[PDB]
């Protein structure tokens, strides 16, 4: 990714089954 | 299971899963059926319940 992304950047990976916009996000990994 | 996916029952799971015992309808209304031809052949009111 050359471009849009940025420095050192969190990214929505492992469970995006239930991933929907709105709901509140929690980080394990 | 994850997201986008779905499943069916079939076989004679699919004839239980249309319906696996719609008879006790058919025993509520032949119990109806039952009890208002024996009140014509009693001909009287509640006489058929015994």
Not at chain 2, 24 to 36: D, G, H, T
Request: aromatic share 10%.
């Amino acid at each position: 990714v050359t471009e849009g992304l940025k420095a050192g950047d969190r990214v929505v990976i492992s469970g995006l089954q239930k991933v929907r916009p709105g709901v509140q996000v929690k980080a394990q990994e | 299971l994850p997201t986008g996916v779905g499943y069916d029952w079939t076989g004679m799971s699919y004839q239980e899963r249309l319906s696996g015992n719609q008879a006790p309808s058919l025993y509520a209304i032949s119990l109806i059926v039952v009890f208002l031809c024996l009140a014509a052949l009693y001909e009287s009111w509640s006489i058929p319940f015994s």
